[PDB]
mmCIF file of all heavy atoms in Angstrom:
data_model
loop_
_atom_site.group_PDB
_atom_site.id
_atom_site.type_symbol
_atom_site.label_atom_id
_atom_site.label_comp_id
_atom_site.label_asym_id
_atom_site.label_seq_id
_atom_site.Cartn_x
_atom_site.Cartn_y
_atom_site.Cartn_z
ATOM 1 N N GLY K 290 119.153 -32.188 85.848
ATOM 2 C CA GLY K 290 120.314 -32.296 86.657
ATOM 3 C C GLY K 290 121.500 -32.998 86.098
ATOM 4 O O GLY K 290 122.641 -32.844 86.421
ATOM 5 N N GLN K 291 121.348 -33.737 84.916
ATOM 6 C CA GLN K 291 122.414 -34.554 84.164
ATOM 7 C C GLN K 291 123.105 -33.791 83.162
ATOM 8 O O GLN K 291 122.419 -33.202 82.305
ATOM 9 C CB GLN K 291 121.746 -35.850 83.679
ATOM 10 C CG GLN K 291 121.582 -37.024 84.625
ATOM 11 C CD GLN K 291 122.697 -38.020 84.626
ATOM 12 O OE1 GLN K 291 123.537 -38.085 83.753
ATOM 13 N NE2 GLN K 291 122.798 -38.926 85.643
ATOM 14 N N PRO K 292 124.391 -33.742 83.146
ATOM 15 C CA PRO K 292 125.151 -33.026 82.102
ATOM 16 C C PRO K 292 125.086 -33.595 80.679
ATOM 17 O O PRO K 292 125.425 -34.814 80.466
ATOM 18 C CB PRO K 292 126.517 -32.891 82.632
ATOM 19 C CG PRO K 292 126.647 -33.775 83.766
ATOM 20 C CD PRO K 292 125.242 -33.840 84.334
ATOM 21 N N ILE K 293 124.718 -32.830 79.586
ATOM 22 C CA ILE K 293 124.696 -33.277 78.190
ATOM 23 C C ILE K 293 125.990 -32.835 77.401
ATOM 24 O O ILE K 293 126.482 -33.560 76.577
ATOM 25 C CB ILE K 293 123.529 -32.568 77.385
ATOM 26 C CG1 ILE K 293 122.245 -32.707 77.923
ATOM 27 C CG2 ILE K 293 123.521 -33.247 76.033
ATOM 28 C CD1 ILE K 293 121.250 -31.930 77.154
ATOM 29 N N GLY K 294 126.401 -31.587 77.623
ATOM 30 C CA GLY K 294 127.458 -31.045 76.780
ATOM 31 C C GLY K 294 127.488 -29.575 76.680
ATOM 32 O O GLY K 294 126.508 -28.891 77.057
ATOM 33 N N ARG K 295 128.559 -29.106 76.093
ATOM 34 C CA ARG K 295 128.739 -27.712 75.781
ATOM 35 C C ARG K 295 128.505 -27.252 74.329
ATOM 36 O O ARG K 295 129.013 -27.845 73.364
ATOM 37 C CB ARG K 295 130.230 -27.323 76.259
ATOM 38 C CG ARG K 295 130.659 -25.788 75.846
ATOM 39 C CD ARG K 295 131.912 -25.386 76.534
ATOM 40 N NE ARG K 295 131.815 -25.365 77.964
ATOM 41 C CZ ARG K 295 132.944 -25.679 78.715
ATOM 42 N NH1 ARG K 295 134.074 -26.053 78.133
ATOM 43 N NH2 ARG K 295 132.978 -25.625 80.020
ATOM 44 N N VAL K 296 127.641 -26.298 74.173
ATOM 45 C CA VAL K 296 127.388 -25.726 72.853
ATOM 46 C C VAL K 296 128.187 -24.377 72.768
ATOM 47 O O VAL K 296 128.116 -23.537 73.642
ATOM 48 C CB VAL K 296 125.969 -25.410 72.666
ATOM 49 C CG1 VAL K 296 125.582 -24.838 71.383
ATOM 50 C CG2 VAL K 296 125.115 -26.686 72.929
ATOM 51 N N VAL K 297 128.952 -24.223 71.643
ATOM 52 C CA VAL K 297 129.636 -23.013 71.309
ATOM 53 C C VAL K 297 129.100 -22.303 70.112
ATOM 54 O O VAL K 297 128.773 -22.934 69.118
ATOM 55 C CB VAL K 297 131.197 -23.370 71.084
ATOM 56 C CG1 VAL K 297 131.966 -22.098 71.090
ATOM 57 C CG2 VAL K 297 131.632 -24.258 72.265
ATOM 58 N N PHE K 298 128.958 -21.051 70.363
ATOM 59 C CA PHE K 298 128.423 -20.068 69.345
ATOM 60 C C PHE K 298 129.309 -18.941 68.936
ATOM 61 O O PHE K 298 129.997 -18.364 69.827
ATOM 62 C CB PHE K 298 127.163 -19.339 69.790
ATOM 63 C CG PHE K 298 126.067 -20.156 70.454
ATOM 64 C CD1 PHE K 298 126.003 -20.229 71.828
ATOM 65 C CD2 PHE K 298 125.184 -20.821 69.658
ATOM 66 C CE1 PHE K 298 124.999 -20.947 72.483
ATOM 67 C CE2 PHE K 298 123.988 -21.491 70.309
ATOM 68 C CZ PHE K 298 123.988 -21.592 71.580
ATOM 69 N N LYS K 299 129.415 -18.575 67.663
ATOM 70 C CA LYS K 299 129.986 -17.406 67.250
ATOM 71 C C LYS K 299 128.900 -16.413 66.987
ATOM 72 O O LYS K 299 127.791 -16.657 66.574
ATOM 73 C CB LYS K 299 130.849 -17.751 66.106
ATOM 74 C CG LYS K 299 130.360 -17.406 64.758
ATOM 75 C CD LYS K 299 130.377 -18.605 63.714
ATOM 76 C CE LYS K 299 128.901 -18.903 63.236
ATOM 77 N NZ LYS K 299 128.616 -19.511 61.947
ATOM 78 N N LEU K 300 129.119 -15.125 67.506
ATOM 79 C CA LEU K 300 128.251 -14.027 67.405
ATOM 80 C C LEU K 300 128.743 -13.040 66.344
ATOM 81 O O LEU K 300 129.954 -12.856 66.139
ATOM 82 C CB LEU K 300 128.129 -13.239 68.709
ATOM 83 C CG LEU K 300 127.835 -14.080 69.951
ATOM 84 C CD1 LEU K 300 127.837 -13.281 71.170
ATOM 85 C CD2 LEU K 300 126.437 -14.736 69.729
ATOM 86 N N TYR K 301 127.801 -12.552 65.443
ATOM 87 C CA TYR K 301 128.047 -11.676 64.355
ATOM 88 C C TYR K 301 128.177 -10.224 64.827
ATOM 89 O O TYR K 301 127.390 -9.366 64.576
ATOM 90 C CB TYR K 301 126.858 -11.805 63.385
ATOM 91 C CG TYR K 301 126.738 -13.285 62.825
ATOM 92 C CD1 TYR K 301 125.436 -13.652 62.422
ATOM 93 C CD2 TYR K 301 127.778 -14.132 62.661
ATOM 94 C CE1 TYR K 301 125.199 -14.893 61.896
ATOM 95 C CE2 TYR K 301 127.597 -15.410 62.043
ATOM 96 C CZ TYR K 301 126.320 -15.713 61.757
ATOM 97 O OH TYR K 301 126.007 -16.977 61.126
ATOM 98 N N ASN K 302 129.338 -9.992 65.605
ATOM 99 C CA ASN K 302 129.548 -8.734 66.339
ATOM 100 C C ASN K 302 129.826 -7.535 65.406
ATOM 101 O O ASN K 302 129.667 -6.351 65.619
ATOM 102 C CB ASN K 302 130.513 -8.972 67.346
ATOM 103 C CG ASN K 302 131.941 -9.501 66.808
ATOM 104 O OD1 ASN K 302 131.940 -10.345 65.898
ATOM 105 N ND2 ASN K 302 133.035 -9.032 67.348
ATOM 106 N N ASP K 303 130.202 -7.818 64.096
ATOM 107 C CA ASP K 303 130.490 -6.803 63.053
ATOM 108 C C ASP K 303 129.312 -6.703 62.058
ATOM 109 O O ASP K 303 129.431 -6.068 61.030
ATOM 110 C CB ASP K 303 131.843 -7.230 62.342
ATOM 111 C CG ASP K 303 131.886 -8.522 61.551
ATOM 112 O OD1 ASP K 303 131.089 -9.457 61.807
ATOM 113 O OD2 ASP K 303 132.643 -8.604 60.687
ATOM 114 N N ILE K 304 128.103 -7.240 62.324
ATOM 115 C CA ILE K 304 126.898 -7.083 61.500
ATOM 116 C C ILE K 304 125.812 -6.485 62.322
ATOM 117 O O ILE K 304 124.976 -5.754 61.994
ATOM 118 C CB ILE K 304 126.511 -8.495 60.814
ATOM 119 C CG1 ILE K 304 127.715 -9.133 60.004
ATOM 120 C CG2 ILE K 304 125.242 -8.455 59.956
ATOM 121 C CD1 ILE K 304 127.358 -10.474 59.610
ATOM 122 N N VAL K 305 125.636 -7.122 63.524
ATOM 123 C CA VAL K 305 124.633 -6.708 64.441
ATOM 124 C C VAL K 305 125.300 -6.560 65.865
ATOM 125 O O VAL K 305 125.114 -7.361 66.797
ATOM 126 C CB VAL K 305 123.544 -7.879 64.614
ATOM 127 C CG1 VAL K 305 122.441 -7.683 63.361
ATOM 128 C CG2 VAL K 305 124.015 -9.275 64.545
ATOM 129 N N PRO K 306 126.076 -5.497 65.992
ATOM 130 C CA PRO K 306 126.867 -5.199 67.233
ATOM 131 C C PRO K 306 125.961 -5.110 68.473
ATOM 132 O O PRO K 306 126.268 -5.670 69.493
ATOM 133 C CB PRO K 306 127.712 -3.938 66.869
ATOM 134 C CG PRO K 306 126.772 -3.186 65.864
ATOM 135 C CD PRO K 306 126.250 -4.386 65.012
ATOM 136 N N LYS K 307 124.874 -4.374 68.449
ATOM 137 C CA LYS K 307 123.995 -4.206 69.582
ATOM 138 C C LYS K 307 123.330 -5.517 70.076
ATOM 139 O O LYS K 307 123.189 -5.801 71.335
ATOM 140 C CB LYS K 307 123.194 -3.019 69.315
ATOM 141 C CG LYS K 307 122.001 -2.599 70.172
ATOM 142 C CD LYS K 307 121.183 -1.588 69.417
ATOM 143 C CE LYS K 307 119.652 -2.009 69.418
ATOM 144 N NZ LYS K 307 118.937 -1.967 68.176
ATOM 145 N N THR K 308 122.881 -6.400 69.085
ATOM 146 C CA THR K 308 122.184 -7.629 69.387
ATOM 147 C C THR K 308 123.221 -8.658 69.889
ATOM 148 O O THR K 308 123.006 -9.309 70.845
ATOM 149 C CB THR K 308 121.471 -8.150 68.051
ATOM 150 O OG1 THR K 308 120.603 -7.095 67.507
ATOM 151 C CG2 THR K 308 120.718 -9.449 68.373
ATOM 152 N N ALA K 309 124.424 -8.758 69.279
ATOM 153 C CA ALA K 309 125.442 -9.605 69.735
ATOM 154 C C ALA K 309 125.967 -9.226 71.123
ATOM 155 O O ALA K 309 126.274 -10.078 71.927
ATOM 156 C CB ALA K 309 126.572 -9.507 68.677
ATOM 157 N N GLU K 310 125.925 -7.938 71.415
ATOM 158 C CA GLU K 310 126.488 -7.501 72.689
ATOM 159 C C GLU K 310 125.488 -7.873 73.841
ATOM 160 O O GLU K 310 125.807 -8.394 74.949
ATOM 161 C CB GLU K 310 126.727 -6.036 72.614
ATOM 162 C CG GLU K 310 127.175 -5.395 73.940
ATOM 163 C CD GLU K 310 128.334 -5.927 74.555
ATOM 164 O OE1 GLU K 310 129.348 -6.249 73.886
ATOM 165 O OE2 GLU K 310 128.367 -6.154 75.850
ATOM 166 N N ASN K 311 124.103 -7.733 73.606
ATOM 167 C CA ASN K 311 123.134 -8.137 74.543
ATOM 168 C C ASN K 311 123.379 -9.634 74.929
ATOM 169 O O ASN K 311 123.395 -10.020 76.048
ATOM 170 C CB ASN K 311 121.750 -8.040 73.893
ATOM 171 C CG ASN K 311 120.559 -8.270 74.756
ATOM 172 O OD1 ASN K 311 120.451 -7.519 75.660
ATOM 173 N ND2 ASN K 311 119.734 -9.258 74.554
ATOM 174 N N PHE K 312 123.393 -10.465 73.931
ATOM 175 C CA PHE K 312 123.655 -11.839 74.130
ATOM 176 C C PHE K 312 124.950 -12.212 74.857
ATOM 177 O O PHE K 312 124.944 -13.072 75.769
ATOM 178 C CB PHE K 312 123.615 -12.563 72.761
ATOM 179 C CG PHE K 312 123.432 -14.069 72.856
ATOM 180 C CD1 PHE K 312 122.068 -14.581 73.097
ATOM 181 C CD2 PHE K 312 124.452 -15.063 72.785
ATOM 182 C CE1 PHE K 312 121.913 -15.914 73.149
ATOM 183 C CE2 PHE K 312 124.154 -16.315 72.909
ATOM 184 C CZ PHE K 312 122.942 -16.809 73.179
ATOM 185 N N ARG K 313 126.082 -11.462 74.480
ATOM 186 C CA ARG K 313 127.344 -11.758 75.034
ATOM 187 C C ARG K 313 127.370 -11.493 76.641
ATOM 188 O O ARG K 313 127.637 -12.364 77.497
ATOM 189 C CB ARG K 313 128.378 -10.889 74.401
ATOM 190 C CG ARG K 313 129.790 -11.170 74.909
ATOM 191 C CD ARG K 313 130.730 -9.847 74.880
ATOM 192 N NE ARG K 313 130.200 -8.697 75.562
ATOM 193 C CZ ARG K 313 130.407 -8.615 76.867
ATOM 194 N NH1 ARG K 313 131.021 -9.485 77.499
ATOM 195 N NH2 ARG K 313 129.966 -7.496 77.505
ATOM 196 N N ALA K 314 126.965 -10.256 76.911
ATOM 197 C CA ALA K 314 126.772 -9.827 78.329
ATOM 198 C C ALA K 314 125.755 -10.697 79.103
ATOM 199 O O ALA K 314 125.968 -11.061 80.286
ATOM 200 C CB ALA K 314 126.209 -8.289 78.215
ATOM 201 N N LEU K 315 124.732 -11.193 78.497
ATOM 202 C CA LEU K 315 123.842 -12.118 79.135
ATOM 203 C C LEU K 315 124.446 -13.512 79.459
ATOM 204 O O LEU K 315 124.093 -14.304 80.430
ATOM 205 C CB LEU K 315 122.401 -12.257 78.358
ATOM 206 C CG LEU K 315 121.376 -11.036 78.238
ATOM 207 C CD1 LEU K 315 120.123 -11.449 77.482
ATOM 208 C CD2 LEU K 315 120.946 -10.680 79.674
ATOM 209 N N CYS K 316 125.329 -13.987 78.528
ATOM 210 C CA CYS K 316 126.032 -15.214 78.700
ATOM 211 C C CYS K 316 126.989 -15.098 79.850
ATOM 212 O O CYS K 316 127.193 -15.942 80.734
ATOM 213 C CB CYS K 316 126.885 -15.559 77.487
ATOM 214 S SG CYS K 316 125.936 -16.159 76.104
#
């Protein structure tokens, strides 16, 4: 229940477009 912080990620959308899209849409 206690807040830790925000983690930010860059996705390799120009190397693995279908895997990066799955993850983006699930976020």
Side-chain angles (χ1 to χ4, degrees):
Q291 277 268 342
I293 308 174
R295 176 170 296 148
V296 180
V297 188
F298 313 97
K299 103 229 117 152
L300 310 177
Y301 300 154
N302 62 316
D303 67 332
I304 302 170
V305 281
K307 172 191 128 226
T308 308
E310 182 54 44
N311 189 62
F312 199 80
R313 183 212 59 82
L315 291 182
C316 285

